Design an enzyme around this catalytic site. Sequence first.
Site, PDB file in Angstrom:
ATOM      1  N   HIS A  41      11.306 -27.085 -95.119  1.00 25.85           N
ATOM      2  CA  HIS A  41      11.236 -27.963 -96.321  1.00 25.85           C
ATOM      3  C   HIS A  41      11.752 -27.255 -97.591  1.00 25.85           C
ATOM      4  O   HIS A  41      11.932 -27.950 -98.617  1.00 25.85           O
ATOM      5  CB  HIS A  41       9.851 -28.555 -96.486  1.00 25.85           C
ATOM      6  N   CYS A 148       2.931 -21.633 -99.311  1.00 27.39           N
ATOM      7  CA  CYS A 148       4.005 -21.895 -98.314  1.00 27.39           C
ATOM      8  C   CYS A 148       5.025 -20.759 -98.257  1.00 27.39           C
ATOM      9  O   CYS A 148       5.452 -20.288 -99.332  1.00 27.39           O
ATOM     10  CB  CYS A 148       4.772 -23.158 -98.653  1.00 27.39           C
TER      11      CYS A 148
HETATM   12  N1  LIG Z   1      -0.809 -28.980 -98.740  1.00 23.52           N
HETATM   13  C1  LIG Z   1      -0.416 -27.854 -99.323  1.00 23.52           C
HETATM   14  O1  LIG Z   1      -1.214 -27.016 -99.772  1.00 23.52           O
HETATM   15  C2  LIG Z   1       1.059 -27.606 -99.443  1.00 23.52           C
HETATM   16  C3  LIG Z   1       1.990 -28.656 -99.365  1.00 23.52           C
HETATM   17  C4  LIG Z   1       3.350 -28.419 -99.497  1.00 23.52           C
HETATM   18  C5  LIG Z   1       3.774 -27.120 -99.731  1.00 23.52           C
HETATM   19  N2  LIG Z   1       5.075 -26.655 -99.856  1.00 23.52           N
HETATM   20  C6  LIG Z   1       5.102 -25.208 -99.991  1.00 23.52           C
HETATM   21  C7  LIG Z   1       3.621 -24.840-100.253  1.00 23.52           C
HETATM   22  C8  LIG Z   1       2.873 -26.072 -99.846  1.00 23.52           C
HETATM   23  C9  LIG Z   1       1.515 -26.310 -99.674  1.00 23.52           C
END
Ligand SMILES: NC(=O)c1ccc2[nH]ccc2c1
Length: 182
Positions: A41, A148
């Site tokens: 992503h 992430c």
């Molecule tokens: N749900 C989350 O904590 C989440 C969602 C999308 C993300 N993209 C990169 C870090 C990250 C964390």
Amino acid sequence: MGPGFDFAQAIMKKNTVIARTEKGEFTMLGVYDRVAVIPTHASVGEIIYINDVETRVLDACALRDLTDTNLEITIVKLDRNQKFRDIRHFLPRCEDDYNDAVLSVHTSKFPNMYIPVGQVTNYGFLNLGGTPTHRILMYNFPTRAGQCGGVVTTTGKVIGIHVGGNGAQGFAAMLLHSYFTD
Ligand SMILES: NC(=O)c1ccc2[nH]ccc2c1
Ligand SMILES: NC(=O)c1ccc2[nH]ccc2c1
């Protein structure tokens, strides 16, 4: 604070860079030579910023399993003038559960961040942002938007990269030794 944090720190200090795409800043794990990983992503293109330096992408491959299901790992080869320490011998060979893991993040927003996440479950299938995803690890820590790409370790093993969460749990894509045979 303990031997878990010691191993995590050793990985962060030598094998991470700050990657910036049009979708934001990510922790990026360097694995060997000029080969690194990032969540799919992140949408890696032809050019990426590595520690705020404009860098050509020589190759980028969004990994899928042999059922043609998303794994959420992109392997990137960077046109960089320097190699990573080879850490492939710290990668697990098989899908597994783990005790006592640490999630480590290094960005402009979260420098030198280390989280003891505890027990890690081989969760398997997850609908991640609407995309069926396999080989997911789960930990019971309310991870936030920004961790992430962060490296999940135990003592002696680099087991995954953080790819999402639901507010109560966090989810990582497995790293396997077989992804990085040259
Ligand atoms: N749900 C989350 O904590 C989440 C969602 C999308 C993300 N993209 C990169 C870090 C990250 C964390
Ligand atoms: N990831 C978290 O849940 C978390 C908890 C407390 C915090 N305070 C400063 C940043 C931060 C992140």
